[PDB]
Write an enzyme that holds these catalytic residues in place. Structure first.
Site, short mmCIF file in Angstrom:
data_model
loop_
_atom_site.label_atom_id
_atom_site.label_comp_id
_atom_site.label_asym_id
_atom_site.label_seq_id
_atom_site.Cartn_x
_atom_site.Cartn_y
_atom_site.Cartn_z
N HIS A 61 -4.87 7.73 -1.04
CA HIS A 61 -3.46 7.79 -0.71
C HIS A 61 -2.56 7.33 -1.85
CE1 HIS A 61 -5.07 8.13 3.39
NE2 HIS A 61 -5.82 7.09 3.07
N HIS A 91 0.36 -0.96 -6.23
CA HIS A 91 0.15 0.48 -6.17
C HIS A 91 1.52 1.13 -6.25
CE1 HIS A 91 1.01 -0.70 -2.03
NE2 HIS A 91 1.68 0.44 -2.01
N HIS A 93 4.11 4.72 -5.09
CA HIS A 93 4.41 5.94 -4.36
C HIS A 93 5.26 6.80 -5.27
CE1 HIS A 93 3.18 3.90 -0.54
NE2 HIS A 93 3.63 2.84 -1.20
N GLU A 103 10.08 5.19 -1.51
CA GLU A 103 10.06 4.99 -0.06
C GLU A 103 11.38 4.41 0.42
OE1 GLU A 103 6.13 3.03 0.76
OE2 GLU A 103 5.71 5.12 1.34
N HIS A 116 4.84 -1.20 -5.52
CA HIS A 116 4.69 -2.24 -4.50
C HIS A 116 3.67 -3.25 -4.98
CE1 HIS A 116 6.14 0.68 -1.15
NE2 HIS A 116 7.14 0.14 -1.81
N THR A 195 3.98 0.42 4.85
CA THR A 195 4.49 1.78 4.86
C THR A 195 3.38 2.82 4.99
OG1 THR A 195 4.49 2.00 2.45
CG2 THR A 195 6.46 1.08 3.51
N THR A 196 2.13 2.40 5.10
CA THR A 196 1.01 3.26 5.47
C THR A 196 0.33 2.67 6.69
OG1 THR A 196 -0.49 2.11 3.94
CG2 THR A 196 0.54 4.13 3.15
#
Ligand SMILES: CC1=CC(=O)NS(=O)(=O)O1
Ligand SMILES: CC1=CC(=O)NS(=O)(=O)O1
Ligand SMILES: CC1=CC(=O)NS(=O)(=O)O1
Ligand SMILES: [Zn+2]
Length: 257
Positions: A61, A91, A93, A103, A116, A195-196
């Site tokens: 992801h 990590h 996004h 995000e 993040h 957020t996941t």
């Protein structure tokens, strides 16, 4: 299994994770004119000098850099936080194009990516216990815009070819996450969630106002990663971001006037 495609993406997550429709979900739009300056908010304390990075991993992801959190080595304190939060991993996004990927949004503006730095509250002893607590995690969120290169990101970008597909990892020792921070530590903060999946409502969000700039070449290398595992049909790891969720009964506080 959940992901970011048409048939398994964020609009589907609530079926396996009903908290997706909960009261403190993340990310959110930060309406800068409605955020309230809170003079009682302390400056953030980011103490990363003794950080020990361990591995870099494509987890299907995102990709993450994992740290030794068995000791108070890289810790976040102050700001809105009570107590000490250990850095576990960071990590990103990002988008398929520079106009999306973050995000959180700022007055509906999407950044090209969002970093993040995930920390957990040491009073709960381990991250698994922390995620079950309303104040278990603190995530430092940093926006990325495309412009000049970020030299402190290059060591990350250059190893991504070795973790192209889901499940691949590599040694990633002696990486200094201080090289990913902007000049200012001015921030917004609000109570939110992962957020996941599992979307646990355990996060104090600390989102920095100042983006870092990264080069187009650096973000292009993000976009060459794969969601798929080795040997499977190649599906580029892009647009691995959850959209803004309803703010509901929450106030976003600003550390700065
Ligand atoms: C676009 C897409 C999103 C994802 O998360 N997994 S996938 O490989 O099925 O394809
Ligand atoms: C993710 C990744 C980044 C890169 O730089 N080369 S690659 O296309 O082999 O794989
Ligand atoms: C573990 C975790 C999952 C993720 O994707 N973003 S986050 O900052 O909420 O932290
Ligand atoms: Zn994240």
């Amino acid at each position: 299994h959940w992901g970011y495609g048409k048939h398994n993406g964020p609009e589907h997550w609530h079926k396996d994770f009903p908290i997706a429709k909960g009261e403190r979900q993340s990310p959110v739009d930060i309406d800068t004119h409605t955020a309230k300056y809170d003079p009682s908010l302390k400056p953030l304390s980011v103490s990363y000098d003794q950080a020990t990075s361990l591995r870099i991993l494509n987890n299907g992801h995102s990709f993450q850099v994992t740290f030794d959190d068995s000791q108070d080595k890289a810790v976040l304190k102050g700001g809105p936080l009570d107590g000490t939060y250990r850095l576990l991993q960071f990590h990103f996004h990002w988008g398929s194009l520079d106009g999306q990927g973050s995000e959180h949004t700022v007055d509906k503006k999407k950044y090209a990516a969002e970093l993040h730095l995930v920390h957990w509250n040491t009073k709960y002893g381990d991250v698994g216990k922390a995620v079950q607590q309303p104040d278990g995690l603190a995530v430092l969120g940093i926006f990325l815009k495309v412009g000049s290169a970020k030299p402190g990101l290059q060591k990350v970008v250059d190893v991504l070819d070795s973790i192209k597909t889901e499940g691949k990892s590599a040694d990633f020792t002696n990486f200094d996450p201080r090289g990913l921070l902007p000049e200012s530590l001015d921030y917004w903060t609000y109570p939110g969630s992962l957020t996941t999946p599992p979307l646990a409502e355990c996060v104090t969000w600390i989102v920095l106002k100042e983006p870092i700039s990264v080069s187009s070449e650096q973000v292009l290398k993000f976009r060459k990663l794969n969601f798929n595992g080795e040997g499977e049909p190649e599906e580029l790891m892009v647009d691995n971001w959850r959209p803004a969720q309803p703010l509901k009964n929450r106030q976003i506080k600003a550390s700065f006037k």
